[PDB]
Design a protein around this ligand. Sequence first.
Ligand code: COA
Ligand code: COA
Ligand code: COA
Ligand code: COA
Ligand code: COA
Ligand code: COA
Lengths: 148, 149, 149, 148, 148, 148
Amino acid sequence: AMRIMRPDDANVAGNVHGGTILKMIEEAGAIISTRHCNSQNGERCVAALARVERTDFLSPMCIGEVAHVSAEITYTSKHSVEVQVHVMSENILTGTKKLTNKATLWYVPLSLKNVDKVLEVPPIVYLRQEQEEEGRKRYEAQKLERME
Amino acid sequence: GAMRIMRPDDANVAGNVHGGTILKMIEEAGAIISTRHCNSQNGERCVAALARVERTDFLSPMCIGEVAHVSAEITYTSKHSVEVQVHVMSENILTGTKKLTNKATLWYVPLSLKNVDKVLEVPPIVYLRQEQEEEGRKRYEAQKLERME
Amino acid sequence: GAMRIMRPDDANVAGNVHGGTILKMIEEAGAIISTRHCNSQNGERCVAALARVERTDFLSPMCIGEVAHVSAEITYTSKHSVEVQVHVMSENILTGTKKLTNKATLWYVPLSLKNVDKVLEVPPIVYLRQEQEEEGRKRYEAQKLERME
Amino acid sequence: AMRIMRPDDANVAGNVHGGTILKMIEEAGAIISTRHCNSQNGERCVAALARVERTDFLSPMCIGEVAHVSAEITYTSKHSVEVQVHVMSENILTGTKKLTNKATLWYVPLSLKNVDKVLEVPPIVYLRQEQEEEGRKRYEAQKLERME
Amino acid sequence: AMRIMRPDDANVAGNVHGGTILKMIEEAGAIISTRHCNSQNGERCVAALARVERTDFLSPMCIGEVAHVSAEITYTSKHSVEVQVHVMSENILTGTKKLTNKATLWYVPLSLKNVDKVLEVPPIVYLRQEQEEEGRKRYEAQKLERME
Amino acid sequence: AMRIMRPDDANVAGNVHGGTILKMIEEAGAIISTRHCNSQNGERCVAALARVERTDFLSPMCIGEVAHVSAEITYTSKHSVEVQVHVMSENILTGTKKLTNKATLWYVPLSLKNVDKVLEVPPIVYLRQEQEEEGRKRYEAQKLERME
Ligand SMILES: CC(C)(COP(=O)(O)OP(=O)(O)OC[C@H]1O[C@@H](n2cnc3c(N)ncnc32)[C@H](O)[C@@H]1OP(=O)(O)O)[C@@H](O)C(=O)NCCC(=O)NCCS
Ligand SMILES: CC(C)(COP(=O)(O)OP(=O)(O)OC[C@H]1O[C@@H](n2cnc3c(N)ncnc32)[C@H](O)[C@@H]1OP(=O)(O)O)[C@@H](O)C(=O)NCCC(=O)NCCS
Ligand SMILES: CC(C)(COP(=O)(O)OP(=O)(O)OC[C@H]1O[C@@H](n2cnc3c(N)ncnc32)[C@H](O)[C@@H]1OP(=O)(O)O)[C@@H](O)C(=O)NCCC(=O)NCCS
Ligand SMILES: CC(C)(COP(=O)(O)OP(=O)(O)OC[C@H]1O[C@@H](n2cnc3c(N)ncnc32)[C@H](O)[C@@H]1OP(=O)(O)O)[C@@H](O)C(=O)NCCC(=O)NCCS
Ligand SMILES: CC(C)(COP(=O)(O)OP(=O)(O)OC[C@H]1O[C@@H](n2cnc3c(N)ncnc32)[C@H](O)[C@@H]1OP(=O)(O)O)[C@@H](O)C(=O)NCCC(=O)NCCS
Ligand SMILES: CC(C)(COP(=O)(O)OP(=O)(O)OC[C@H]1O[C@@H](n2cnc3c(N)ncnc32)[C@H](O)[C@@H]1OP(=O)(O)O)[C@@H](O)C(=O)NCCC(=O)NCCS
């Protein structure tokens, strides 16, 4: 995703609201996860946001700057999808680019015809085994935590 | 607090509200409460910027036509930061049914309006129970440590 | 209630909020409170439609960056209509200053979702004092009579 | 003004919210009043909404219908402008047009340089003599009402 | 159509984005073409934008100025509608009016019930036979550009 | 640049309005052109839209489908930028993709210090020589159309 930041995206200091960026982040996560969950022509479904991991906002973004939002599916469990989203600001006058934040989201597919039906998530192929292993450990961390 | 009716543009094709919609509302509540507090002792004029979102689980869906209720509370202050806990509740105004959608914790930092990116001191808060100050102090130390990776 | 920070698109070239912006927020509060009430006894599912806005004066300006606080109360019910009083207060979160922006009164009529333009019976509200019902009944009669010129 | 009504303009029933129409009405009033209060090259100003008269909503408007919003300055006092706004719905499939609402609004011009400075309003030309007298009577009745 | 230009319509300097005006232009074209294609109570339809002809932006528009959009159906073929749209900027503080844009659009009526069914366009009334001839030439010109 | 199509982007049939797409195309054109015109760190400028030409809408896009907007600078004259934009629709439930739109936009860099000052456009490198010649022919034809 690429969008010019507008006055209504920003506070009175002209700096973009956290909420504006969070919204864009989730939009990217929703597209990528829904596409994936339908990618093997299983039951028609839409991915629902189940969890947002801790995220830190490192640098401001200003009106007139371009928000760049990119997403990657980094893990899949039996019924869930982990998405990592990166947000970068670009000033197209000066050329300066800054990392706004990195967020991690967990999605769960729900049947279009039965909203209470959690679907199985198709596997992804990992470029690196360490990526599957790291993803598994993150999956475990949140599973264990939610087990109270 | 804050409430608003969920509209078509707030929801997916299933009729369920996008997480991003609720996240935006949560941050709107945090911004108001933290900005007010950071100017509450008439210090240098400032606006609270969102520094951190803690992990948060979405427990129940919300649908078009349901009312999102968003409430915020300042639960800790450090020298230069504000911790805010936000609760989101969905209300179906046809059936009456209310459900807890989400609980989220946020951290804000006040930045001067006049001095670009100047971090300001946060006025102290008073704790209903002193157990709460200690718990908040522990939460503060935990994020301070986690960020210094 | 409802609260929202005023944004540049809410305001004219001078930074002052448009009447239309506030009118919209007023009606949003009215729509929620009246719809909830009209479904509160689980009658035929319905949505409250705005029938009337009483005369209303805008007492003080609001500015970009101030927080609009909107609060509503059902003050009367007739057989098929709901009277709602709405208060709008501005809050400057930098200075702490609060001002009454506007008081408005609205009338809603519940319409069936299933049966188009079917007007439904409104559940009675509880009054703390008989005087409240009498005062509302007088306002109801006034507008009812006027709608015959 | 003429605008197609969209889903976000309407409730779950597909009927346009009163609030949406109210916002459009005020937009029409703001334009006509601001243009008028600058029409004699006085101090630059913007008209602010002072009063909305009682108004009844007669017929619903639906998603996909076209809202027609028309305004006319019907009276001016020394420092205020009376505006009548009509809203009509047009169904462009069926051809059917309906009167949604008629509203009267009062605006007061405020200096751009000084928000607290109320400016004098230029006179309007009345097509009929009786119209000025009618507007004058309404002005005095509301001015006398505002006592508290 | 008339609308005041707002901060979100414009860049950091306060000049209106072309996209904002393009959106307004298309809205006007969609209304006028849809009404016409349903004017004889044929199968219920909505006119879809098929083409924008070479449109030129002649002068900037600013926040606070009023955009005036006017549309006219200038030619009809068997299954399409040519619409010419004019955009005028009005500064309501100074009184200045400027021609912002002239655009020519082509619409095709599609059945509402029957997803992608192209319908016949009712013929338009011409004031002079010369107008039909000129329209025909423009019709043939766009046909040629499209066949390359 | 991706985004999901929402109810307010579309008509009563669920099909996206031409205006919605035109706005997205222009946003992409504005970003790429402004970035390019500041790429050699000349006088700070923003590129203003001057022309939209010969843009055709080939297939409908629906609510819930994802719009993919891709921009490319295809010609530069001394003071203007030609941008070609393609819009592709993607159904993330079915996987189906369709070419929605092909557009051509001309931008002109205007100094931020002097809003009437048309700046020089840095040259671009052409992947195939033939593209420059084709671009020049298009450029000459439109520049002469603004003469004859
Ligand atoms: C918030 C910000 C100003 C902090 O910058 P910094 O270099 O860390 O500033 P300092 O080192 O002086 O620290 C100031 C305070 O901020 C706190 N802080 C900084 N980052 C934090 C984070 N991610 N989470 C919680 N607190 C944080 C520090 O703990 C410190 O408070 P303390 O002294 O009471 O412990 C900076 O990270 C920033 O501008 N981020 C972007 C904010 C923003 O624009 N958000 C929306 C983006 S769309
Ligand atoms: C996501 C949701 C459907 C899960 O419900 P549930 O009763 O826990 O479902 P299950 O017990 O069958 O678990 C299904 C999967 O979801 C995962 N899950 C559930 N809650 C989760 C959370 N908070 N974070 C990460 N994963 C979660 C489970 O781990 C399981 O996947 P796995 O078997 O691969 O490990 C439910 O919490 C929900 O509807 N949440 C709201 C979603 C939404 O609408 N979001 C937007 C709100 S605005
Ligand atoms: C409108 C406003 C400037 C009037 O303030 P005031 O103290 O009464 O000012 P003045 O006494 O000098 O009156 C100026 C004119 O306004 C008129 N007026 C004041 N309140 C009015 C009302 N509510 N309805 C109609 N006219 C009104 C007066 O009659 C006078 O006109 P006149 O001399 O021709 O009779 C003030 O109430 C205000 O700023 N309101 C908020 C306007 C606004 O921002 N609207 C949008 C809110 S979101
Ligand atoms: C409100 C509406 C349904 C009433 O229609 P109606 O033909 O008068 O219906 P009824 O005669 O059966 O009257 C039903 C109730 O509505 C009330 N009513 C009707 N118009 C009213 C008005 N303008 N103000 C207050 N009450 C009104 C009647 O008093 C009656 O209540 P009661 O029996 O307790 O006295 C109708 O005027 C309408 O559909 N208006 C448009 C509503 C709308 O869509 N609003 C937004 C427009 S953008
Ligand atoms: C585009 C604009 C700057 C050109 O004005 P002008 O008086 O013709 O300026 P010039 O004669 O000096 O022409 C400068 C360049 O613009 C080009 N140009 C002007 N109009 C053009 C058009 N409609 N299409 C393509 N190129 C155009 C010229 O070809 C020239 O480039 P070149 O020297 O490489 O050939 C002017 O018409 C303008 O400000 N338009 C409005 C732009 C805007 O605000 N867009 C959004 C409106 S909502
Ligand atoms: C408009 C559309 C239905 C035409 O499809 P088609 O296969 O060419 O249909 P037909 O061959 O039956 O042609 C019907 C008419 O459309 C016209 N037409 C099609 N594309 C056109 C274009 N690019 N410019 C002008 N006219 C066009 C033809 O000239 C023909 O008119 P005629 O018979 O009077 O000469 C198709 O291109 C489409 O669905 N485009 C997208 C429309 C849309 O959804 N717009 C918004 C996109 S966000």
